[PDB]
Symmetry: C2
Subunit: 145 residues, 2 copies
């Protein structure tokens, strides 16, 4: 019972794209991507642990803009003239590993909602992908059809 509809920067490293990342972003195997990890709190309780990847070949230098309090949507718009037009989201449950348990302050093995989101711009071009993890005791999702 706290409703998500349907910011601390931990790290950002430039890494080669894994198979599933390269597949979602429609880019070459091992392409350079920025791996941005952020924790969203509400309140001093960790609410969402976010890992987003930006293809450096589309947004060259995008890592350099990253910092606490920075709106990446504003960076995309102001710096690269890109605004997302739609997104595709999948929702599953996955199970916390060492990293998630640290940042979400939970136990290894705890059930987490995983939202796997791919954002797109004009002509169905993927621009970034995000995986948001939330402890299942801490959130309810609202969907208004």
């Amino acid at each position: 019972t706290e409703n998500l509809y349907f910011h601390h920067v931990l790290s950002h490293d430039i890494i080669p794209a894994s198979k599933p990342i390269a597949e979602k972003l429609q880019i070459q195997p091992e392409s350079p991507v920025v791996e941005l990890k952020r924790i969203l709190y509400n309140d001093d309780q960790p609410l969402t642990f976010e890992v987003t990847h930006y293809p450096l070949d589309l947004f060259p230098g995008i890592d350099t803009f990253i910092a606490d309090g920075v709106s990446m949507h504003d960076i995309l718009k102001q710096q690269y003239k890109v605004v997302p037009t739609h997104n595709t989201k999948l929702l599953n449950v996955v199970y916390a590993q060492q990293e998630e348990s640290k940042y979400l302050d939970c136990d290894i093995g705890d059930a987490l909602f995983e939202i796997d989101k791919t954002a797109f711009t004009s002509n169905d071009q993927p621009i970034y992908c995000s995986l948001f993890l939330m402890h299942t005791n801490r959130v309810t999702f609202t969907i208004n059809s």
Copy 2:
């Protein structure tokens, strides 16, 4: 994923019962109003995929229990018998934990994590018409929102 429920059939039972507090609150009817409690299972193959419990207020849909049978589209009954079509719905998604009844119908263990989708359907004038709780084992489904 697994099996894919996009966001945005055997009849187990139907009984006429008094509305609970939460059901009467959702349906905006008097406490203990008569409701039809329709329980159904939807199967993937032989695998139980959704255990549905839906409540229809008998005061809005008098005699609606008499239309209930395997294979019946309740949306069809509402439309032809009552001239009602839903115009929108609210849905909440949570995780809950199987008790004896769910464990039987969903063929899982007591205590297993289930997704619960809590749905209220509405017609013209924002009038609630029925409410549903769908339970699905967490290993067996992925939801898509696009």
